[PDB]
Amino acid sequence: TTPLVHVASVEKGRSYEDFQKVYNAIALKLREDDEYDNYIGYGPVLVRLAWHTSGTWDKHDNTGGSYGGTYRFKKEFNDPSNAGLQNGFKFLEPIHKEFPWISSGDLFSLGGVTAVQEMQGPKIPWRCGRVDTPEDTTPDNGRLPDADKDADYVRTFFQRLNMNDREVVALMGAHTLGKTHLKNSGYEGPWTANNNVFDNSFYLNLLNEDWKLEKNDANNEQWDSKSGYLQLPTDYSLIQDPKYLSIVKEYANDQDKFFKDFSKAFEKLLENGITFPKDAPSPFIFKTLEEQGL
C-alpha cells in the first residue's frame, strides 16, 4: 500500500502555554512519585516509552512512528519489546485525564522530553501536532532492537530510523538512565549509580570499568563490572567497533557535546515520519520546574 503522509495538526487553539502546563503536570508528578523502582523515579521509563513509541518507525514506508500514538492499542502495548512500559503509561493516565485535548503521540513524546529535562539533561525542542490514528495502523511487534547482537546489527538496525553513527552513539547514551529488570527483558542491573540524573556517565563507565562477560539468571549474556553495573552486548559493541569507539570517547570527554548531540538526535527520533507545515509553530522549548521556581 502507498506510504501515508502524516501532517502535524496543532490541537485546536492550543499554544506554548498549554503545553508548558502539560509539561509542568508531568514534571510535578515525577517529583511526587519518587518511590517508584527503588526510588529511581519514573524518569527513565518515561524516556524509554517515548523512544519505543517512536522507534517503530520505518523510513521505507512511513509506518509506525510517534505520530499515531498506537501504543494505546493492545498489539503494541503487549509487544514483548515493550515489557515494563505499562508503568510509564499508567503514570501518564492522570495527566491525560487532566489534559484530554492532547493527542496520545504528543503525550508519549512530551513525557520523554519532560523526563530528560527534569533529570538535568539538555533542553530538547518539542513540536506538537501528532494525531491519533486507528487501531489498524498499529505496527506489528518486532520493530524494536534486540540486545544480544553486535555493532553490525546496531548500525544496520538504526539505518531504518535514518540514524547515522553519531546519532546512534548519542541516543544509546540514554542508558545513563534507569536499569534493566530481569522480569521485563531478561537482563538485570543499572548502567550507572546516579541513574535518575541525565549525564555522560554511561560512556565513562563503558570506557573505565573492568568488564566481564557473564550470564545473568535468565541465561543471557551481559557485561558486568564489580562496581555493580552492566552493559548489554549492544552497548558494549560501541567500544568493539572502531568508528563507534571514537564517538564514545568524544562524549566521555565532552559533556556539552553529548548534550547537544543527544538533544538533536532525540528530537529527530520523536519527529520521524511527521510532516510539519511551513506555517506550523516553531519548536517549543519548555522551562523546567526549577527554572520556573515551581
Nearer to ligand HEM, 21 or 183 (CB): 183
- Mention every residue, 6+ apart, whose C-beta is less than 8 A from residue 32: none
Q: Write down the least CB distance from residue 212 to K ion, Å.
A: 21
Pair 222, 209: CB distance under 8 Å:
no
For residues 144 and 197, which CB has a smaller minimum distance to K ion in the complex? 197
Q: Residue 63's beta-bridge partner residues?
A: 58
Which position's Cβ is nearest ligand HEM? 178
Q: Is 175 assigned a ligand-binding role in the annotation?
A: yes
Provide the binding-site residues for ligand HEM, judged by CB under 6 A.
44-45, 47-48, 51, 84, 145, 147, 154, 171-172, 174-175, 177-181, 184-185, 187, 232, 234, 266
- Cα(178)–Cα(46) distance, integer angstroms: 10
Which residues neighbour 227 within 8 Å (Cβ) at sequence distance 6 or greater? 193, 205, 209
Minimum distance from residue 41 beta carbon to K ion (Å): 12
The nearest distance, CB 200 to ligand HEM, in angstroms, is: 14
Instruction: Check residue 194 for interaction with K ion (CB under 5 A).
Output: yes
Residue 192 contacts which entry, ligand HEM, K ion, none (Cβ below 5-8 A, type-dependent): K ion
Q: Crossing angle of helices 43-54/86-98, nearest 10°? A: 90
Binding partner selected for residue 27 from ligand HEM, K ion, none, CB under the kind-specific 5 to 8 Å limit: none
Q: Where are the alpha helices (DSSP H) in the chain?
A: 16-32, 36-39, 43-54, 74-77, 86-98, 104-118, 151-159, 165-172, 182-185, 201-208, 233-240, 242-252, 255-271
Q: For 6, phi and psi rounded to 5 degrees?
A: -110, 105
Choice among 51, 191, 211, 223 that is catalytic: 191
State in angstroms the smallest separation of the CB of 26 from ligand HEM.
15
Shortest Å, Cβ 40 to K ion: 11
**Can you tell me the distance from the alpha carbon of 221 to that of 184, in angstroms, rounded to the nearest whole number?**
15
Identify the DSSP state of 99.
-
CB of 60 to ligand HEM, least distance (A): 19
Stretch of 5-13, 44-52, 168-176, 227-235 contacting K ion, by CB under 5 A:
168-176
Q: Concatenated DSSP letters for 262-280? A: HHHHHHHHHHTTEEPPTTS
Residue closer to ligand HEM (CB basis): 99 or 244: 244
124 beta partners: none
Q: Residue 36: is it exposed, middle or buried by C-beta count within 10 angstroms (0-12/13-18/19+)?
A: middle
**Catalytic one of 52, 57, 211, 223:** 52
In the complex with ligand HEM, the residue whose CB is nearer, 99 or 233, is 233
Closer residue to ligand HEM (CB): 19 or 187: 187
Residue 52 catalytic? yes
User: How far apart are the two ends of the chain, measured CA to CA in Å?
Assistant: 49
User: 191 catalytic, yes or no?
Assistant: yes
Among 54, 201, 205, 231, binds K ion (CB under 5 A): 201
d(CA 294, CA 274): 33
Smaller CB separation from ligand HEM, 14 or 175: 175
Contact between 275 and K ion by CB under 5 A: the answer reads no
Give the catalytic positions in this structure. 52, 191
Binding-site residue positions: 175
Site residues, K ion (CB under 5 A): 176, 192, 194, 197, 199, 201
| Binding site as annotated, residues for heme b | 175
